[PDB]
Amino acid sequence: DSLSKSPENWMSKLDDGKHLTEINIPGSHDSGSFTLKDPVKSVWAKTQDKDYLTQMKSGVRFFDIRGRASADNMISVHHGMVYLHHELGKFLDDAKYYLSAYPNETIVMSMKKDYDSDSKVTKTFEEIFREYYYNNPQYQNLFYTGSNANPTLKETKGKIVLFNRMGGTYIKSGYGADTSGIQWADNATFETKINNGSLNLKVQDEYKDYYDKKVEAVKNLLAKAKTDSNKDNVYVNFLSVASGGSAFNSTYYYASYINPEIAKTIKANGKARTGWLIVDYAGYTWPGYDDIVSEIIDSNKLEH
């Protein structure tokens, strides 16, 4: 049966000799925003309706955690200025729970500063994450701490791999974990070397695009991935787009079009390499339409 038939443990069915970069991985954009209930706010600030555990059950393996330092020992999960009602510990604990339940999966956790620190804060965002989370004995063994820039599934399964969107860091394991960090171009499709030249990161993150331009930018990077068997190359492709347009169109509304359009394209490509595709409303189904998370999972080729 289809891998998308067992989303809760799909990675367990792959050759663990694969480099994570080579795996087609569904991600959720602003993963933590499922806590939002305020309907006026949710139009533009809510990007998911499944909680973290349910997103994992649904096969999501890449988490977009954007944060704000709200005390010298605390990072709160945020969508820009909007507080998402929990701290990073909650994500970590859920991840840790899911990984012991499904220990042949790995999670890639992207970490970004999304808003200015609370005025009492005396430490940088990167220092707080490094000291109060990554290095914290409480989360001992949860993070990938290997020295490989291009780790395999074997060496990462059971753990969270950092995907560093903080800037330069003194953390030494994970994507962009060095004193340069990742050069991220605003609202752009771009390409930049990371991990001291070891990896070429190719990103589509045109989050302010109107609809047609967004779909075209998702497909342009999709088409590139399909031609590229290089493991030293990493694709991150965000289908998520910012709210606005003809009425005051929600992030959901756009996801209801983009997700099925890309799901279908991938399905028609069969087993082509896709890269890591980051979506809004991961796991949200619409009768009659292909499901993006499911098609990303199924696009992985089992050759072993």
Side-chain angles (χ1 to χ4, degrees):
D1 299 294
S2 198
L3 291 165
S4 67
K5 293 322 178 55
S6 75
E8 70 286 3
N9 73 342
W10 68 269
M11 291 174 137
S12 70
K13 329 266 175 191
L14 313 165
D15 180 357
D16 73 346
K18 291 265 196 247
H19 287 90
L20 297 199
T21 59
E22 291 177 293
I23 294 169
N24 304 333
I25 299 174
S28 56
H29 161 242
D30 271 335
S31 304
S33 71
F34 59 85
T35 55
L36 290 181
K37 294 286 153 251
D38 172 325
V40 173
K41 208 153 65 198
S42 303
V43 166
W44 58 272
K46 189 175 165 109
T47 52
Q48 305 297 338
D49 65 336
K50 283 174 168 64
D51 63 30
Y52 291 133
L53 287 181
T54 312
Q55 291 177 213
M56 295 157 196
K57 294 229 75 225
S58 289
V60 175
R61 303 284 186 270
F62 177 110
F63 294 81
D64 183 24
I65 311 306
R66 301 179 191 215
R68 179 236 203 160
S70 61
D72 279 354
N73 62 346
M74 173 167 73
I75 287 166
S76 298
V77 184
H78 259 67
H79 173 112
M81 58 164 309
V82 186
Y83 182 41
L84 302 181
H85 307 294
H86 62 276
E87 278 52 71
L88 174 56
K90 189 233 181 309
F91 176 72
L92 297 183
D93 288 340
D94 283 354
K96 176 184 175 155
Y97 176 89
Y98 194 86
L99 289 161
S100 68
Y102 299 95
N104 295 304
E105 305 307 290
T106 182
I107 278 145
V108 174
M109 178 196 71
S110 181
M111 178 55 48
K112 186 194 173 302
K113 189 191 175 170
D114 225 36
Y115 190 68
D116 307 284
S117 311
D118 177 290
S119 89
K120 64 198 178 123
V121 169
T122 76
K123 297 180 141 127
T124 67
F125 190 100
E126 181 274 350
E127 170 174 9
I128 283 159
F129 175 77
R130 175 167 36 82
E131 285 179 6
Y132 285 98
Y133 295 94
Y134 189 88
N135 286 357
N136 188 335
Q138 185 172 164
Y139 307 110
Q140 203 195 306
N141 299 311
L142 215 210
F143 296 99
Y144 175 72
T145 57
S147 53
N148 192 358
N150 199 169
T152 50
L153 178 49
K154 193 179 296 297
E155 52 198 309
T156 61
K157 66 185 190 185
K159 284 146 179 282
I160 299 154
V161 190
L162 180 64
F163 182 91
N164 180 36
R165 286 190 65 186
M166 291 178 309
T169 186
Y170 300 105
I171 293 181
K172 287 158 155 193
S173 303
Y175 306 100
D178 57 32
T179 60
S180 305
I182 292 181
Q183 284 171 253
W184 206 277
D186 187 38
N187 185 47
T189 289
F190 62 94
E191 156 176 359
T192 189
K193 294 276 191 51
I194 66 174
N195 294 270
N196 193 33
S198 297
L199 295 177
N200 198 10
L201 168 63
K202 307 172 168 211
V203 170
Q204 181 278 118
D205 184 28
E206 306 176 17
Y207 64 88
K208 299 184 295 182
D209 275 7
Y210 202 53
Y211 178 79
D212 291 300
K213 184 77 170 142
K214 180 66 168 191
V215 168
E216 180 196 63
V218 171
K219 295 180 162 178
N220 193 115
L221 197 64
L222 193 70
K224 296 210 191 167
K226 155 167 173 209
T227 69
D228 182 6
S229 61
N230 195 157
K231 53 153 159 34
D232 285 332
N233 283 346
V234 52
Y235 292 82
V236 184
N237 192 347
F238 288 78
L239 312 207
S240 43
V241 79
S243 157
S246 77
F248 262 86
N249 309 257
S250 71
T251 67
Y252 170 84
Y253 164 96
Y254 285 120
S256 69
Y257 288 96
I258 296 170
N259 288 355
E261 183 49 37
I262 313 306
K264 151 177 149 285
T265 302
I266 291 167
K267 180 153 152 292
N269 273 147
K271 294 290 171 274
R273 175 191 198 182
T274 60
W276 302 350
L277 264 63
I278 323 305
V279 314
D280 284 337
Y281 291 97
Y284 203 110
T285 46
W286 296 283
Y289 294 95
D290 307 305
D291 174 52
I292 184 64
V293 172
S294 289
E295 297 305 322
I296 290 150
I297 289 169
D298 289 343
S299 80
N300 291 291
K301 186 148 80 205
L302 312 158
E303 253 150 334
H304 61 309

